[PDB]
Design an enzyme around this catalytic site. Structure first.
Site, PDB file in Angstrom:
ATOM      1  N   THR A 118      20.079  69.059  81.374  1.00  0.00           N
ATOM      2  CA  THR A 118      19.136  69.241  80.238  1.00  0.00           C
ATOM      3  C   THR A 118      17.432  68.577  80.764  1.00  0.00           C
ATOM      4  O   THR A 118      16.634  69.139  80.242  1.00  0.00           O
ATOM      5  CB  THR A 118      19.293  69.122  78.904  1.00  0.00           C
ATOM      6  OG1 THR A 118      18.116  68.835  77.922  1.00  0.00           O
ATOM      7  CG2 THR A 118      19.914  67.464  78.857  1.00  0.00           C
ATOM      8  N   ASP A 173      28.931  60.297  80.247  1.00  0.00           N
ATOM      9  CA  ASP A 173      28.150  60.859  81.556  1.00  0.00           C
ATOM     10  C   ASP A 173      28.801  60.536  82.699  1.00  0.00           C
ATOM     11  O   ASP A 173      28.866  61.453  83.511  1.00  0.00           O
ATOM     12  CB  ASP A 173      26.872  60.659  81.230  1.00  0.00           C
ATOM     13  CG  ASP A 173      26.008  61.143  79.803  1.00  0.00           C
ATOM     14  OD1 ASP A 173      26.672  61.673  79.260  1.00  0.00           O
ATOM     15  OD2 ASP A 173      25.002  60.365  79.333  1.00  0.00           O
TER      16      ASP A 173
END
Ligand SMILES: Nc1ncnc2c1ncn2[C@@H]1O[C@H](COP(=O)(O)OP(=O)(O)O)[C@@H](O)[C@H]1O
Ligand SMILES: Nc1ncnc2c1ncn2[C@@H]1O[C@H](COP(=O)(O)OP(=O)(O)O)[C@@H](O)[C@H]1O
Ligand SMILES: Nc1ncnc2c1ncn2[C@@H]1O[C@H](COP(=O)(O)OP(=O)(O)O)[C@@H](O)[C@H]1O
Lengths: 516, 517, 516
Positions: free
Chosen positions: A81, A382
């Site tokens: 993103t 992540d």
């Protein structure tokens, strides 16, 4: 009601430039963190792209729609993103400039599609394979931790992540991120991590100090009413006579006595010594008078158990959950190798390991009792996602701003065709890919054009993938340091940017209507 | 903003707006005339007399415009007026129609160069196809009715009531001098005004005609040389007043005797030098008329600046308003000066024609001074129309019968050559339908039915709408046998000037700035 | 009082863009004319660059200073004030964009100087020579007339110009534009030109109809008082006695009689027949009683002569101007071969030709009595200036927008050095040279990018000087049609543009002070 002008494209370009200028200082490891507080004074620190875009109050509807579209395409790859709005804004600015100069959006769209196809072909032809081992995953996890968390505690987490990945992955099918539980505690220190190879039980027993060196233990999961409460009950409805309720209480006590005698005789039959231990998990309470008689023979009974705990216990070991304490086959009794009791805080924890099929790893983390623990959890998530993405494929291309320069050089010099209309879009698409190195050099603390022309000269003289150094600003090679990236992430980012830039220039007029 | 100082509203947008609206508003105050109709307009400027006119020349000569687009057409109008006789509103109507039809082409999205090229091609085609509708022609100019018909047709445009007597008088005055063959001048015909009876008692007379009385004697000799002067009977001796009642009679008698002797010596020196008559332009006196009667010297009375100006520009003398008696230096060519009694008034007649350069002066008379102006205008218009400098005038059926034929020819020619030049040709062809529309709208009926009827009969080119009530709806009449024709060169010059003005207007169209001090 | 910002450069760029947008529609033969009216309603039609810039009212001081600087550089070459503000505005816009991006004006100035040097070297190496004849000058004059006057009367003007140039130029030294007098008259037609090989005299004689076929004629210039006025005079002071003034008048009459007798005896001595005529020029009046006696023997005398007429007469022929009518040497009497009297209007003109050393050509022109005659005179003057500029050198390079494309291709491709800082200015200087063909194609009535890329592809395929066609928009060669240009004009234009663009970006702050 009636509007026939070009103010819609103007306000769209303005909103795009505003959204690009708002979020542009969060690229690279040397970025600046952000804070959000509004609800009852809750201080929340963040630096991610999707987490920020999902929790903001944007006053512009076009910017909100763009952010929603960008966040809707984040569930495909790991983290893509970020580093996307800048290229889109640059392409939109170039398109607006070309429209103000005098052109048609169809030729611009055709040129953008041709440039995207050329970039995809160049990326497919420039890819290279590499044998996956331990150093590559270590470097990937280290880079992910450096891009997420500061350069301090990024060394004790990558090793644990690699160890958990090596312990979980051992087959040929793709792994699943559903067998790893990330728990949290409350301590006084900051850097405190642990990699448990077994299960974790929050609750224990009310009468401690008896035994803790139980080797081969047998665990049985049930859900019968052993000791819920000493208060008199009936059938969920109060009455007036006390004889009936006291007889019901006496019958319940007799049933509890029969059940504890049955489990005592079962433990005596299936064991008879002190080495073969037994552990019982129950969500109801346990009376101390019966717990003492149970522990006198050598069987521990736990109270107040969660549903997820027994679910993980019956999924890792493999036991049948029945509603009876009768003498049945010992096939449903799970085996346990090592049991330990950790005493810290106001509740003792239980650690069970050395069981059959070790497919349950726990990453225990501790914090200084604040909100940074959630940030550390998001960072390690992540990192695990990046490790999983770097293990599914076998080709890893270098990064550090060494792919956009070659792409622009191939799109500008070696033109696929000879056409001015297509070149008018090819140049705009190639000039929008050099914003990442410029932004990186600006955020690192150096110049913007000097380093750019230096990297250009180094790539024109040599011919290798030249990266960007965030220490001295000198052009270096990113193929020998340790900076790596992914493969499908760049393709997904290019596809998303092309889709966003395509369905924007075709906007004609914006009318004020609608009721729903 | 950067050039203009908040004075004009010019820029990159007034090309198809402010530069056409001014011409449209200028031409809108002119379509009310054009044709035999009674649409008189009052003109109030500086004379303060309140007079009504009908022609657009005097209307445009008094209106003050402050726009370059409106001033670019008055130059072409003056050029057309100086060139041929009539022709003024046609150029303005053509320019207005061309601008109104080019406004649509400019609003659609076409460059001005293509429109200019198409307009030039259409003008060239019209000029090439023009010498093809010649019907009647001039036979002999020595007759009377042959030119009287043309004079009546030319006068019918102005006055509709009386037009036969004036045409006959103009024909008799023009045939008594010289025809169009050889050499014929225009400034040799004068018009005099006599305040007496009506216009039903006019006549003609060859030579000079002036309303000047005579208080002396009839001098019908050839040695009576003229001697024009400014104000000879002004005041050579200025007398003042000494007391309040009266002074001594001796000094007054001496001054009177001295003045009498001085004037006697003056008239003796002016008569013995070779001048029997004298032209005075001042007052009169008892001793003056006494000496003029006892010396046989003709003395005038009426004085006017126009009379002395004409006498100076015709003969070639010079007035000497001096006190001392000068010498005879005003010798001319006149010799035969006779007196006549017309309308109980004394008039002079000069005879000095040697069959070359003859002059004439028609006698005009009306009720008031506000009615002879239109008569003089019609007379001078007919005189200018009679001059064509060609033996064969090659008259064409005017009134609108040729405009429709020219438009149809241009339309048929434009539907052949391909490219982006057909729109301008179609516009130039459609712009020719502005003459019958203005003639039908100024009568009392509509113009669409008239145009449909004119286009539905046949392409003969000799059909036009009449003026009576029995010729408005059908509009089917043959003007060839009636006697309604127009000038061939006049229409050509008008079309050329209109095309030139349209080209000049469409060319200069960008930004109108100012000039530094 | 105190200001430390960058608004000065912003307002300078704004004023430059405004001045460029105001004057940009007057390029090429298919340009739109303008009009100027303010002084007592005087309609003036013009289309030149310097004439418009010299007579305008500008409300901006920077634009006024720029216009003054541009007009102060037009006295060097012929006409180079036009097609200059566009390149300067483009360079200033590029410099402003590079400053907003982040750079220093010193590097921009260095790159601009390097690009100017490279363009000068390319123009010096690309030049070519051509033998000067009659067709080249004819084509040059035709192009100069087409760039000013319409394509209707651009034939008899250039023919007369070439004839006058061939009749005047016959030596080796550079010619001078001071021996050609351009007169004007008033007629009814429009196209009316004449090339007289002799002198023109406006005034003539008061008593015409005597003789006009005078071959060999002797002309003598003087300034004695032959017949000034019949009024009695003295010494510029009125007196009271009449005897003195009447005696002075009688003495003046006796002197006039003696002078006319002396000139009569001189004519009788130096001639005696009717073939050798004697023409006298005097600025004073001539009495008819004496003029008749003079013409009875065969000597003509003119009255009311201007100073320039006698100056040209004594400069072309070569006579001494004395103040006496005595019998002197006939060495000061000029010779005339043919004398003609033209009767038109209210004054008869005199044409003298077939004289010694024909170095005086008159270009007579007639108009329809308006203000277009001044425009025709300015156009023929510009044509004569272009012809004189095309005759001093021997090298003529083609034009029609075929020098800027090659210059940009040489500045972009074959780079003189390898430096990003220099390239940042080289690209800006090369991108500003394409403002001529784009504007020409826009004013012709076609596209802007299609013709540009077509010309680019044609030059890349073939390699010759491809021009711009103002008829069909197709790329053609300007070396075979007839379009030519100059040599030093381009160098002067480049020098002026570089000087203007250099001393603009160095502006720091603009304070409000001063008193003078
Ligand atoms: N070790 C490194 N050295 C230099 N640049 C790096 C390094 N790691 C990441 N980057 C840069 O950071 C950019 C992406 O950072 P970011 O937007 O935070 O996403 P991520 O966290 O997935 O890296 C890449 O363009 C890359 O060039
Ligand atoms: N009695 C008539 N019958 C038909 N047409 C006429 C008559 N009188 C005038 N016209 C038409 O009116 C038009 C305008 O005439 P006139 O006013 O004399 O010229 P202008 O309008 O140029 O001053 C002429 O073209 C003529 O054809
Ligand atoms: N015959 C021609 N054909 C095409 N272009 C021309 C022609 N003559 C001149 N030009 C163009 O006009 C431009 C210059 O015009 P202008 O600014 O009016 O100056 P000048 O009057 O000196 O030509 C040149 O760039 C040239 O390309």
């Amino acid at each position: 009601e009636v509007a026939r002008a070009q103010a819609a494209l103007a306000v769209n370009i303005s909103a795009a430039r505003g959204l690009q200028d708002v979020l542009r200082t969060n690229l690279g490891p040397k970025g600046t963190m952000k804070m959000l507080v509004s609800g009852a004074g809750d201080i929340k620190l963040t630096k991610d792209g999707n987490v920020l875009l999902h929790e903001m109050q944007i006053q512009h509807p076009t910017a909100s729609l763009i952010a929603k579209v960008a966040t809707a395409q984040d569930d495909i790859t790991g983290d893509g993103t970020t580093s996307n709005v800048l290229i889109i804004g640059e392409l939109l600015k170039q398109a607006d400039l070309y429209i103000s100069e005098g052109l048609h959006p169809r030729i611009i769209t055709e040129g953008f599609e041709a440039a995207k196809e050329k970039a995809l072909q160049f990326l497919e032809e420039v890819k290279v394979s590499r044998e996956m081992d331990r150093e590559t995953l270590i470097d990937v996890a280290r880079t992910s931790l450096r891009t997420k968390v500061h350069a301090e505690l990024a060394d004790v987490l990558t090793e644990a992540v690699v160890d958990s990945i090596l312990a979980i992955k051992k087959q040929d099918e793709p792994i699943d991120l559903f067998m790893i539980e990330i728990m949290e505690m409350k301590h006084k220190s900051e850097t405190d991590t642990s990699l448990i190879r077994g299960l974790v039980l929050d609750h224990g027993a009310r009468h401690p100090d008896m035994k803790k060196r139980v080797e081969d233990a047998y665990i049985l999961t049930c859900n019968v009413s052993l000791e819920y409460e000493k208060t008199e009950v009936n059938s969920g409805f109060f009455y007036k006579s006390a004889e009936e309720r006291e007889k019901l209480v006496k019958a319940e006590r007799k049933f509890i006595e029969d059940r504890v005698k049955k489990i005592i005789e079962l433990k005596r039959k299936v064991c008879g010594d002190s080495d073969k231990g037994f552990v019982v998990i129950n969500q109801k309470g346990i009376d101390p008078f019966s717990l003492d008689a149970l522990s006198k023979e050598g069987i521990v009974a736990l109270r107040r158990a969660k549903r997820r705990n027994m679910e993980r216990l019956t999924l890792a070991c493999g036991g049948v959950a029945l509603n009876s304490f009768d003498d049945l086959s010992p096939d449903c009794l799970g085996h346990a190798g090592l049991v330990y009791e950790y005493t810290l805080g106001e509740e003792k924890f239980t650690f069970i390991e050395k069981c059959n099929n070790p497919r349950s790893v726990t990453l225990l983390i501790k914090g200084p009792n604040k909100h940074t623990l959630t940030q550390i959890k998001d960072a390690v998530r992540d990192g695990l996602r990046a490790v999983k993405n770097a293990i599914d494929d076998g080709c890893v291309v270098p990064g550090a701003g060494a792919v956009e320069v070659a792409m622009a050089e191939a799109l500008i010099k070696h033109k696929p065709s000879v056409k001015g209309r297509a070149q008018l879009g090819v140049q705009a698409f190639a000039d929008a890919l050099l914003i990442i190195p410029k932004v990186l050099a600006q955020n690192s603390g150096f110049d913007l054009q000097e380093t750019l022309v230096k990297i250009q000269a180094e790539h024109s003289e040599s011919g290798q993938l030249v990266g960007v150094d965030l220490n001295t600003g000198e052009p270096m090679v990113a193929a020998e340091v340790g900076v790596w990236d992914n493969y499908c992430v760049k393709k997904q980012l290019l596809h998303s940017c092309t889709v966003i830039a395509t369905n924007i220039l075709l906007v004609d007029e914006i009318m004020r209507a609608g009721m729903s | 903003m950067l050039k203009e100082g908040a004075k004009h509203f010019s820029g990159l947008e007034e090309a198809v707006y402010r530069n056409i609206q001014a011409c449209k508003e200028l031409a809108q105050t002119t379509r009310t005339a054009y044709g035999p109709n009674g649409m008189n307009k009052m003109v109030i400027n500086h004379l303060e007399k309140l007079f009504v006119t009908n022609d657009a020349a005097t209307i445009l000569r008094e209106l003050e415009v402050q726009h370059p687009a409106a001033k670019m057409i008055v130059m072409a109008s003056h050029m057309q007026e100086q060139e041929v006789g009539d022709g003024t509103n046609f150029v303005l109507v053509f320019a207005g129609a061309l601008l109104e039809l080019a406004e649509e082409l400019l609003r659609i999205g076409l460059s001005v160069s293509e429109v200019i090229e198409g307009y030039e091609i259409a003008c060239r085609k019209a000029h090439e196809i023009l010498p093809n509708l010649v019907c009647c022609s001039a036979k002999n100019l020595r007759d009377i009715d042959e030119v009287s018909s043309l004079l009546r047709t030319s006068i019918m445009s102005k006055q509709y009531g009386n037009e036969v007597f004036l045409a006959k008088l103009i024909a008799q005055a023009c045939v008594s001098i010289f025809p169009d063959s050889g050499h014929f001048n225009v400034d040799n015909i004068r018009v005099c005004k006599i305040l007496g009876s009506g216009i039903s008692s006019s006549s003609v007379l060859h030579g000079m005609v002036f309303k000047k009385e005579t208080e002396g004697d009839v001098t019908s000799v050839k040695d009576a040389k003229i001697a024009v002067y400014s104000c000879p009977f002004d005041g050579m001796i200025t007398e003042t007043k000494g007391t309040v009642l009266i002074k001594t009679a001796e000094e007054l008698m001496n001054f009177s005797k001295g003045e009498e002797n001085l004037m006697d010596a003056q008239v003796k020196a002016i008569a013995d030098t070779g001048a029997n008559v004298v032209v005075t332009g001042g007052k009169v006196a008892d001793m003056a008329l006494h000496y003029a009667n006892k010396y046989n010297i003709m003395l005038v009375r009426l004085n006017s600046k126009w009379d002395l100006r004409r006498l100076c520009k015709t003969v070639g003398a010079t007035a000497l308003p001096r006190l001392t008696p000068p010498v005879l230096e005003e010798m001319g060519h006149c010799d035969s000066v006779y007196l006549s009694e017309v309308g109980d008034t004394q008039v002079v007649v000069f005879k000095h024609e040697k069959e070359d350069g003859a002059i004439s002066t028609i006698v005009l008379r009306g009720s008031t001074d506000n009615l002879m102006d239109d008569i003089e205008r019609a007379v001078d218009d007919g005189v200018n129309t009679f001059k064509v400098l060609t033996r064969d005038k090659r008259l064409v059926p005017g009134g609108g019968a040729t405009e429709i034929e020219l438009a149809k020819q241009i339309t048929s020619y434009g539907e052949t050559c391909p490219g982006l030049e057909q729109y301008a040709i179609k516009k130039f062809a459609e712009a020719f339908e502005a003459i019958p529309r203005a003639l039908a709208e100024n009568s009392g009926v509509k113009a669409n039915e008239v145009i449909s009827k004119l286009y539905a009969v046949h392409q003969e080119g000799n059909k036009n709408v009449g003026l009576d009530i029995e010729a408005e709806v059908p509009a089917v009449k043959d003007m060839l046998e009636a006697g309604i024709l127009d000038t061939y060169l006049g229409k050509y010059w008008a079309i050329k000037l209109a095309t030139n003005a349209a080209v000049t207007v469409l060319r200069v169209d960008q930004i109108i700035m100012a000039k530094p001090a």
